[PDB]
Design a protein around this ligand. Structure first.
Ligand SMILES: *[C@@H]1O[C@H](CO)[C@@H](O)[C@H](O)[C@H]1NC(C)=O
Ligand SMILES: *[C@@H]1O[C@H](CO)[C@@H](O)[C@H](O)[C@H]1NC(C)=O
Ligand SMILES: *[C@@H]1O[C@H](CO)[C@@H](O)[C@H](O)[C@H]1NC(C)=O
Ligand SMILES: *[C@@H]1O[C@H](CO)[C@@H](O)[C@H](O)[C@H]1NC(C)=O
Ligand SMILES: *[C@@H]1O[C@H](CO)[C@@H](O)[C@H](O)[C@H]1NC(C)=O
Ligand SMILES: *[C@@H]1O[C@H](CO)[C@@H](O)[C@H](O)[C@H]1NC(C)=O
Ligand SMILES: *[C@@H]1O[C@H](CO)[C@@H](O)[C@H](O)[C@H]1NC(C)=O
Ligand SMILES: *[C@@H]1O[C@H](CO)[C@@H](O)[C@H](O)[C@H]1NC(C)=O
Ligand SMILES: *[C@@H]1O[C@H](CO)[C@@H](O)[C@H](O)[C@H]1NC(C)=O
Ligand SMILES: *[C@@H]1O[C@H](CO)[C@@H](O)[C@H](O)[C@H]1NC(C)=O
Ligand SMILES: *[C@@H]1O[C@H](CO)[C@@H](O)[C@H](O)[C@H]1NC(C)=O
Ligand SMILES: *[C@@H]1O[C@H](CO)[C@@H](O)[C@H](O)[C@H]1NC(C)=O
Lengths: 491, 491, 491
């Protein structure tokens, strides 16, 4: 009237944070953690401390050949990836084609050193016109012009003698060399420009064995030209020579490019500003600081990125189901201001809440470990995802699509089920921990107290604060009080 | 002699349905659900309400060029995919080759609009023979013939003047244009057919810059011909023109094809009948209504399909382990005609079974949620799986094989383990629910009754049907009967 | 003073074996099993009882054409895969190129029958020089030589008459036929070697329609040659004929190869010895006997292999957490020499340990099943992983890299989490089993004994060895002793 009491219960708070489990939707929970990265800085950034190459209105092709309408950031000796607009305004001003263009973009996607040098001075053409090879298709300062890195040689007097030029790579580095051939409209234009009716370009390295022949066809006007310019490239190794021989139609190198190549990336399509930021994961929509194992921003990423997932939320439960003084069988304790599982007692020294420090710490460590495993076991590797295939490589582009879609399907399913399964394990863990605490006490107390059925015990003896501490410590001395207990019990 | 009683127990039935768990094989279970789709309608069907193009005995090539032995369904203005036989009987009647054939099949796999038009009338050839270009290799009504969409021009008198033809696409739609070149057996055949010993075909658009030259070689007879026909195609954009120039060996266009293209699919190899059905997933062996997240019919599918898996059964447990009146410790209750977990009682008003409605509903909802999650979290995307690579693309075909086999291995393993793990969770859930019910009662009753050890309690007081209902409701008033209980108890 | 006793407890041993769970790191455990294969025999082995083709210092190209510096194992009529060194010393002694080289390596990766035959005897050249076609680039026994399978025909007197040669495949098997063209340095060398200034090679089968023309360019010296040799191949079906016609520059077949092809593999890069072993999984670093579902040796494997994983250990718990006489609440029993869960008793016949055979067997079966499922559900398929793409196929090689890296990421994550999740299930299973045993006893004994709170019961009646056996058997007859029990109890 009334006997001392100890109750077992668990933390409750004012959290409205919701979680899903394999078995229940929308469970209110004490604390939760999202493992889905959803935020980007809306900028293009350095990748592992190397600037990108941003081409504002120029194709890689326009940029390499010196399309004179390309007004770009000129000096840039290395880069980590390339940014183009979807459809650049300035490509090949004089219409035509670039041989193995996509393989060259991929080779140039990431470059350790890039330095333009002069391999054949425009001034070295003594028996051909170096300054007439100009077109209204390729306008400069209002006046007719041409690609600036490459020379459109025309006949001098009414003669086009055979060109023989060798260039020996005396540099330490590989040379990217560019040249072209003019496909004229007819035999009259052919002889008007090059005098000789039948022409070739021969090009030889230790590797290359090329002979080009112009092709006449009747073609639609593009940039007001029915002629076509076709471009070719090789990499000249650092002690090899390249040998040019031509009768006509030769678009000669003036400038070539020293390159050092240490691994590739790809070409990103984006309309974003550079932002001086560093990042380890770039997206067409912005960069990401990628601690989280999953993201939903954009598939077309370059770097060490979270796995891309079709998903709005991946929220793990970290806390508990959230809902005399009665114990656990009737709900949680707002009063348990600290601790996850613990006790409420009332004796002649007064009443209050005490955390079970040991079971609380064990459980916090467990849940922290669960979250860190799900994050830290994720293998993160460098990859570069772009669209590098042309409109006659549609079968290969379909192969890439099935693979990308394939991985999106596997990761989206596994992350969703992983969160549902583990959330159910976590909430069941909390129930298992509370019930085990109740049993820890029930087994110490035996017949020295009575189970009240609500998660509380009423003692058959005086249990001061020091007795209570021994119950919470698991050091309760049953023999010490069996005598006093038995007297009140038999009555 | 004898006291009132309440027992805790669970549903049992005459089910022989079996399930596997990570830990036990062949567990008999009250109710189970298969999540593996194994059934197909054995027919080719519309895909999202668009008919397929079924070519009974004709290659795409034979069909486009008008191989005169192709007796096909002529009119068909759109389609969702193409069906060919493994080795069609009718391909190129006059032997030869089709340039970038596989890329053209892929472009044509799915078409929004397809309409054949006449771009160059057979009657427009005033200075060349339009009706002699015929062969015994390409038989029609017993008589020698040729591809019907394309004209094999021969010299007239003993002259083959230079052809110059332009066609301007004044249509709203892209044009697929087809032409070819004849590779004759020798210089005598060359001049016998075309008079001129040295010939070319030049073709130009805003894109195309082609010059073809016939090739003599001594070749094996195919369909009794040692000559070869080589075919080329372009897509002419809706305000461009195509310009043809030829000296000889020209297989001229007569008919071209207006096309509208909105996304691709692939070419399916099947010997099935069309069936007027609609479907969202087509298989070479038949269509599928794809609610289930997995299937085992065939890898080579087109549409939004379940994931393909090497597996005969993926069966989830939905019910319970299946096996006075004693309670749960001795087995299940055939008498529990309704409910999963509940009670049996016996008092002076009589005996019977009562379902624990709350715990039963919670558990049914849980298991329904588990099944729906495993089904509904599956990301389903459109894909088209075929074999689109030629016998010099074997490395790329091996790349595709490793990817396909890769995904089959991941999905087959994850589905099998998913079912084994969750089956074990489900059966352990049922045990956890029954035991918690027993405890719900034990904690209400305390010393007002005695545990019989078999899942039953014997009351120390009269418990009429209204007392029993309060035990099942969790509203049992222990104080109301402690007095009566204690008297019978002390004795 | 003192009463008979029965205790519930579990096995403990001197194991230091450690395991991880989703929630705890470094749990000491009674017994564990690694499912990650980490061991290889450091040798190249037969694959499913078929020898490899090991090329010690020769390229496939060098080997097929008979580079005279290739000192290889000559006779070898079938093989399962090919082994090359990263950069073979002996390739094309006379510099040049091999057309569709990579597709030919892939075709030859695995061969059922391979037999070199003579299709055109060197002695059959009556109007051309068959023994002058020799070079200092291709040295033999100190003296100038050439590829041995193919004849470099030179003019005789000062004449190079037109070659016309047919070979009809009268063999039962497909023929791999090889030929080439010489690209000389200039018009003087052209006529010095072949007399005719303007030359061609025409080659025709039922399939092939080729016309080759030599190409002059000024080229860097390689093996002291500025000339180039370009090689071509076809597969001649078993009743077709191949027809050669040439004016000059013809590198003629002498020897061709009968082949039978039944499925492909790839080319492995390794510096290992053959070892007479058989295997179902070969690695560049050594073979594997692949019972385990995962391995971490090397990605570039051929056969039916475990899944490749970035991981040092995948260790499953199979045993228990490892740590009067007290029962389970105070730790494990070194004394439980046999069994997982069981009992300790003490009566007037003496004291000792007894295994709960039924619950122990159920648990051993469960854990054995868990391990076997995780191993046996793994779909294992034949695959061949190599690097088969050239330096202008870098985009496709990047496609293959993303796929390979993709599968490594999926398998590494799923195996790591699978082991963490199941380890937690296994340890929780053991706790659930021990606690259920304690309850099995508590429910049989009821008030005929008292719970001591440490996992032990003290009996209120004499419990001889035969009573004890009935408690362990679940056949304990409570009524038989309630009388004796109640007397000692009321006191
Ligand atoms: C869960 O919560 C949200 C409210 O934020 C609601 O939209 C949804 O309908 C709820 N229930 C289910 C079954 O998803
Ligand atoms: C071209 O150059 C000069 C005339 O300026 C003259 O010496 C030369 O012969 C001219 N050639 C011809 C063929 O007119
Ligand atoms: C280029 O110059 C170097 C250094 O003078 C020389 O050794 C080398 O042979 C030259 N390269 C060629 C292909 O001639
Ligand atoms: C637990 O509580 C008792 C009583 O307050 C105290 O004396 C003892 O030091 C504690 N025991 C342990 C092991 O912490
Ligand atoms: C399980 O059930 C089937 C009978 O339908 C039987 O074939 C199989 O052998 C049984 N046991 C095991 C271990 O698979
Ligand atoms: C061919 O056409 C007619 C003869 O029918 C004639 O006017 C023409 O000159 C003929 N040509 C030759 C060269 O025979
Ligand atoms: C085709 O006709 C249109 C309309 O007459 C014209 O504007 C267009 O320029 C023509 N196309 C070409 C390439 O000439
Ligand atoms: C439960 O049972 C009692 C006795 O039949 C009834 O009076 C009461 O309305 C019920 N209580 C609830 C909360 O359903
Ligand atoms: C676990 O065990 C190993 C000792 O073998 C140790 O290196 C490691 O630091 C321990 N703890 C954790 C948290 O990994
Ligand atoms: C080459 O062969 C012999 C000389 O040995 C002779 O009959 C033949 O005419 C020679 N040809 C020429 C054109 O010298
Ligand atoms: C090759 O010889 C066979 C048998 O004599 C013959 O039937 C076949 O037609 C020949 N092949 C060719 C293409 O001539
Ligand atoms: C169990 O133990 C009792 C007493 O030793 C023995 O008589 C009986 O045969 C056993 N019962 C069973 C079912 O094994």
């Amino acid at each position: 009237d009334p006997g001392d009491q100890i109750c077992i219960g668990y933390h409750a708070n004012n959290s409205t944070e919701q979680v899903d489990t394999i078995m229940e939707k929308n469970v209110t929970v004490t604390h939760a953690q999202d493992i889905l990265e959803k935020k980007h800085n809306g900028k293009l950034c350095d990748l592992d401390g190397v600037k990108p190459l941003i081409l504002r209105d120029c194709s890689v092709a326009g940029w390499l050949l010196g399309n004179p309408m390309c007004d770009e950031f000129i000096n840039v000796p290395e880069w980590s990836y390339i940014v183009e607009k979807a459809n650049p305004v300035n490509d090949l001003c004089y219409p035509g084609d670039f041989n193995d263009y996509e393989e060259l973009k991929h080779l140039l996607s990431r470059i350790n050193h890039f330095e333009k040098i002069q391999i054949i001075p425009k001034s070295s053409w003594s028996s051909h016109e170096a300054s007439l090879g100009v077109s209204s298709a390729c306008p400069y300062q209002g006046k007719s012009s041409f690609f600036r890195n490459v020379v459109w040689l025309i006949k001098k007097n009414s003669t086009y003698p055979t060109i023989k030029r060798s260039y020996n790579n005396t540099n330490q580095e590989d040379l990217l060399v560019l040249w072209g051939i003019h496909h004229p409209n007819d035999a009259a234009e052919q002889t008007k420009l090059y005098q000789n009716p039948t022409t070739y370009i021969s090009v030889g390295t230790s590797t290359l064995n090329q002979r080009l022949v112009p092709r006449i066809a009747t073609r639609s006007k593009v940039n007001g030209q029915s002629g076509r310019m076709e471009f070719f490239w090789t990499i000249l190794k650092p002690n090899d020579a390249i040998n040019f021989e031509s009768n006509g139609n030769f678009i000669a190198p003036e400038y070539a490019y020293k390159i050092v190549k240490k691994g590739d990336s790809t070409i990103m399509k984006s309309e974003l500003e550079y932002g001086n930021c560093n990042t380890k994961c770039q997206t067409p929509m912005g960069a990401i600081n990628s601690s989280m194992p999953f993201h939903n921003i954009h598939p077309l990423t370059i770097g060490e990125c979270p796995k891309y997932v079709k998903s709005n939320r991946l929220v793990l439960a970290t806390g508990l189901r959230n809902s005399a003084i009665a114990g656990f069988i009737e709900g949680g304790w707002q009063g348990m201001v600290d601790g996850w599982y613990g006790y409420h007692h009332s004796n002649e020294q007064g009443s209050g809440y005490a955390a079970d420090k040991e079971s609380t710490q064990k459980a916090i460590d467990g849940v922290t470990n669960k979250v860190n495993s799900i994050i830290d076991k994720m293998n993160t590797q460098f990859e570069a995802v772009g669209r590098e295939f042309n409109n006659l490589e549609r079968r290969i582009e379909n192969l890439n699509k099935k693979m990308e879609d394939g991985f999106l399907d596997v990761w989206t399913y596994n992350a969703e089920l992983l969160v549902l399964m583990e959330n159910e394990r976590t909430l069941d863990f909390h129930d298992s921990n509370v019930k085990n605490l109740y049993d820890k006490v029930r087994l110490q107390l035996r017949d020295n107290a009575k189970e009240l059925g609500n998660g509380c015990f009423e003692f058959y003896h005086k249990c001061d604060n020091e007795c209570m501490e021994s119950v919470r410590n698991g050091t309760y001395d049953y023999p010490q009080y069996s005598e006093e207990a038995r007297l009140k019990r038999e009555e």
